[PDB]
Design a protein around this nucleic acid. Structure first.
Ligand SMILES: [Mg+2]
Ligand SMILES: [Mg+2]
Ligand SMILES: [Mg+2]
Ligand SMILES: [Mg+2]
Ligand SMILES: [Mg+2]
Ligand SMILES: [Mg+2]
Ligand SMILES: [Mg+2]
Ligand SMILES: [Mg+2]
Ligand SMILES: [Mg+2]
Ligand SMILES: [Mg+2]
Ligand SMILES: [Mg+2]
Lengths: 51, 100, 267, 88, 55, 117
RNA sequence: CUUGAGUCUCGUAGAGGGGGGUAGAAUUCCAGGUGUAGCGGUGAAAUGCGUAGAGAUCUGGAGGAAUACCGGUGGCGAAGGCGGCCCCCUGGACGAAGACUGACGCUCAGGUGCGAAAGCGUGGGGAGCAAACAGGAUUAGAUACCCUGGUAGUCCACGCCGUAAACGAUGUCGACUUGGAGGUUGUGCCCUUGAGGCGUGGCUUCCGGAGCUAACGCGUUAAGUCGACCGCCUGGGGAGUAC
RNA sequence: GUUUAUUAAAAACACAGCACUGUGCAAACACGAAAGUGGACGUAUACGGUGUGACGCCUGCCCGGUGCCGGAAGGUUAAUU
């Protein structure tokens, strides 16, 4: 997760790495894992994803 | 005789021994009737992370072909070779000649 | 139980439980390199430590250290060794001279085993600490360059260095956790000594002990004059410790030179 | 599954003619001299079960092929085992 | 594409976090997404494609 | 006194709390303050409009020193892991870049089954 | 005899099983720089940790569990299963031209074997979760729900038990029977120029036709239309309990 | 098995096992003013010690009192100066 630039202008671009992790792989880890719920979350909350 | 794409990394400073090993490497493989197609020295490439602590290391590359009864010796030699670091030998995948 | 191939049950025939045997130690004809060895447990005077006083023993055979080097050897078959279970293994060097050695794990058909600096790193022959590798398994080490003493209890003992180490010392003892010891030392290296051996349970009072141990087990047993605690109705209020130790933690080891080591736990 | 040059051999050992691969004379010996080689395996990794599955089912049909063999001719049957040494 | 010495080939196949690249947003035959995914595994250990971009 | 000029910062932001610890390039500490370490507590804190008045607290204990410029670590998500960085630069601060240093297992240990509210 | 079972050939993808390596991340506990009154946590709070220096934070070591990303609506196996990577020993399954034997065949009470989790053994290791346990708080109250800690035990062989919503609450094997958007594998041919293009075998996911269905729904992977065999079912509680 | 030679052989001690703790070796510990010796020519799967007593099934709550294990910042604190 490496930023830094030239020409002092407190830009942005910290969001560029906001979409390759962040709270992303934290929600998975936050409280507990999944165990059987992934047995019904990628193979069940998938009915969410067919169109 | 199964082929083997074997690579490995030897400590930086110790890269002095680079040759003596290399010779005395084919000096057993040559001598079990074995075969060695591809083979080439890579170099003191600068490393991805502090492996063994020291982000620089020679590499090599082997791709040889011989009985596991001889690469077994060598297999553990590395472990009991000090000047060497992370070492690895990939099984056959078949004879590959030429590449880098 | 745990290991292969077998350590036998014992038919419940006559008030009993379990023995303990092994394949290959056939020959009992000890060599010639062994001395009588006396008996009791006195000293030029009275007693010291109670217990211990069984018969039949003898056998002293020999060896530690391995101050033959740059020379091969050939296990000529393991053997039973008393006053120390750990078996033994004969062992011949090329010149034609036998010794006894400790009996580490995978030995039998002569095998390699050659002492000396930079020699066969395997389970067999000793190789001075200095040039002893990641040392994850050592053996009967040596407090000093030429002693050879340490942890002779190869009856399942592990000593384990801490890789390749500096200053010239390292070590994590069997139990006494990490203590340092001169690197110019050595070690049987293999580190094992067959301990499917010490998982048994003699069985039956003397018939076990009494070829060895008397009955330490003496408790209060009343008469509160022969000891510090006992008497009364049939109970023993009163902060239990033998000859006024205080026999729970407390511990002693009050000095003498060393204490040149670090960690050793607590609990 | 097995060594190429040895399979072939066994079919030259047992081909009433040459190259009759899918016979029965052979397919026996094939499953047999396979098993006998699988043998020194499982007395090591003594619980690699799935591996042993097709090892059971191996012998399994090996007998279906002797039962057969024997059902349609004994002369051949007691000539195959005389050499294969089976009957266990 | 079946090895690693093409480590310049494999370089666009990651990110600023190492995070291996899907066969989702690059539906790449999938059976190629296998004979590429694995090479990064086997290669990462050999001091190339750094596991992460924090260390 | 040293007067660094190139030291770092570490923004650890738990949900119910967030600390700002200013350290040096190497790693040695330098100054600090934090959420509950400033007036409001309970859950009145945590909100971003609290965890930058903290930020501007580290400023008065990190100007006894010399910092002509700095970088930052955001170990931890939550309510004050951006806003914290806001009252940063502005209260009189430079900045090379941002680096995230938040936890990341490769599935290694079990986590708190915890909240079964 | 050859299309059924299969044997050889020759391809091929895959978390199939057992053993032996391993590298990276990650907590925690150790060891010191820094550094100061704070951290932790709830709805809030408290219990606990911090001036005997928490936590932050750095540089170091010990060690155990697990392999983000890839990962899939995916892949495998006879079910219970199984995820980095490497090495040896080893199953099965699929296909293409062929090459081979010649009904071997599909069913099976009892018979034998595999057996998620949990638990009992012997012995090992024990980083993190945590029954039981103690504080803490909520309530009338709390033997619970959240908070702070923690024993077993999750882990290892070796062995036992041998039950689960053991799942698709839907045996097996075999040929039928309108299709329509797919997933993954294997082989033919198309200016192979090509992302791709077209036929064709294993597996598979969703709709859904007739038809079956007591409705909901099954529907080429049938809950359609037939054919061999085995299992079980006969009203609720008493009871899978007693003897 | 042993025990109160000579009133008590028992439900006593013992016993295999089970637990605790101590002990890294010149061990702990025991006799000794001492040297030296037993623990043994043993070495943490080894030895002292203490509690319990083949076997199966179990081994709850209390750290306030006392042991001992740990901390040492502050208090008080000997010879001393
Ligand atoms: Mg009495
Ligand atoms: Mg009396
Ligand atoms: Mg399947
Ligand atoms: Mg269990
Ligand atoms: Mg809890
Ligand atoms: Mg439908
Ligand atoms: Mg009498
Ligand atoms: Mg008298
Ligand atoms: Mg009497
Ligand atoms: Mg008793
Ligand atoms: Mg008693």
């Amino acid at each position: 997760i490496k930023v830094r630039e030239n020409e002092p202008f407190d830009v942005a671009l910290r969001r560029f790495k906001r979409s390759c992790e962040k709270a992303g792989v934290l929600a998975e880890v936050r409280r507990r894992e999944f165990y059987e719920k992934p047995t019904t979350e990628r193979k069940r909350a998938k009915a969410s994803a067919v169109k | 005789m199964r082929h083997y794409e074997i690579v490995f990394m030897v400590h930086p400073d110790q890269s002095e021994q680079v040759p003596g090993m290399i010779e005395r490497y084919t000096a057993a493989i040559t001598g079990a009737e074995g075969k060695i197609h591809r083979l080439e020295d890579w170099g003191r490439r600068q490393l991805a992370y502090p492996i063994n602590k020291l982000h620089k290391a020679h590499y090599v590359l082997m791709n040889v072909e011989a009985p596991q009864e001889v690469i077994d010796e060598l297999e553990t030699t590395f472990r009991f070779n000090d000047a060497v670091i992370r070492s690895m030998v990939m099984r056959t995948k078949h004879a590959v000649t030429e590449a880098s | 139980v745990k290991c292969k191939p077998t350590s036998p049950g014992r038919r419940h025939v006559v008030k009993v439980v379990n023995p303990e045997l092994h394949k290959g130690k056939p020959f009992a004809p000890l060599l010639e390199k062994n001395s009588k060895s006396g008996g009791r447990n006195n000293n030029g005077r009275i007693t010291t430590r109670h217990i211990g006083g069984g018969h039949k023993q003898a056998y002293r055979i020999v060896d530690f250290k391995r101050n033959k080097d740059g020379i091969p050897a050939v296990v000529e078959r393991l053997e039973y060794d008393p006053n120390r279970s750990a078996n033994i293994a004969l062992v011949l060097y090329k010149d034609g001279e036998r010794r006894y050695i400790l009996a580490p794990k995978g030995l039998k058909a002569g095998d390699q085993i050659q002492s000396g600096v930079d020699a066969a790193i395997k389970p067999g022959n000793t190789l001075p600490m200095r040039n002893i590798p990641v040392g994850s398994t050592v053996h009967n080490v040596e407090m000093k360059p030429g002693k050879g003493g340490q942890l002779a209890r190869s009856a399942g003992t592990y000593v384990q260095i801490v890789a390749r180490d500096g200053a010239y010392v390292t070590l994590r003892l069997r139990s006494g956790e990490m203590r340092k010891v001169e690197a110019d030392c050595r070690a049987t290296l293999g580190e094992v000594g067959n301990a499917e051996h010490m998982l048994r349970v003699l069985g039956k009072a003397g018939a076990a002990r009494w070829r060895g141990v008397r009955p330490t087990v003496r408790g209060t047993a009343m008469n509160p004059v022969d000891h510090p605690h006992g008497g009364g109705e049939g109970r023993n209020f009163g902060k239990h410790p033998v000859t006024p130790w205080g026999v729970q933690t407390k511990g002693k080891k009050t000095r003498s030179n060393k204490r040149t080591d670090k960690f050793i736990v607590r609990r | 599954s097995l060594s190429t040059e040895a399979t072939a051999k066994i079919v030259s050992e047992f081909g009433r003619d040459a190259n009759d691969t899918g016979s029965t004379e052979v397919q026996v010996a094939l499953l047999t001299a396979q098993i006998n080689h699988l043998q020194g395996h499982f007395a090591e990794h003594k619980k690699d079960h799935h591996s042993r599955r097709g090892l059971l089912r191996m012998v399994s049909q090996r007998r279906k092929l002797l039962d057969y063999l024997k059902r349609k001719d004994v002369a051949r049957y007691t000539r195959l085992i005389e050499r294969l040494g089976l009957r266990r | 594409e079946i090895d690693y010495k093409d480590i310049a080939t494999l370089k666009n196949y990651i990110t600023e976090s190492g995070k291996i690249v899907p066969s989702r947003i690059t539906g790449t035959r999938a059976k190629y997404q296998r004979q590429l995914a694995r090479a990064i595994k086997r290669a990462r250990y050999l001091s190339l494609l750094p596991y992460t971009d924090r260390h | 006194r040293k007067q660094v000029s190139d030291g770092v910062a570490h923004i650890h932001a738990s949900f119910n709390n967030t600390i700002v610890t200013i350290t040096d390039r190497q790693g040695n500490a330098l100054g600090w303050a934090t959420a509950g370490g400033s007036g409001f507590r309970g859950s009145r804190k945590s909100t971003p409009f609290a965890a930058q008045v903290a930020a501007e607290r580290c400023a008065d204990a990190v100007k006894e020193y010399g910092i002509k410029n700095l970088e930052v670590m955001v170990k931890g998500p939550g309510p004050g892991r951006e806003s914290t960085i806001r009252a940063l630069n502005a209260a009189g601060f430079r900045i090379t870049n941002i680096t995230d240093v938040t936890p990341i297992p490769h599935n290694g240990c079990r986590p708190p089954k915890k909240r079964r509210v």
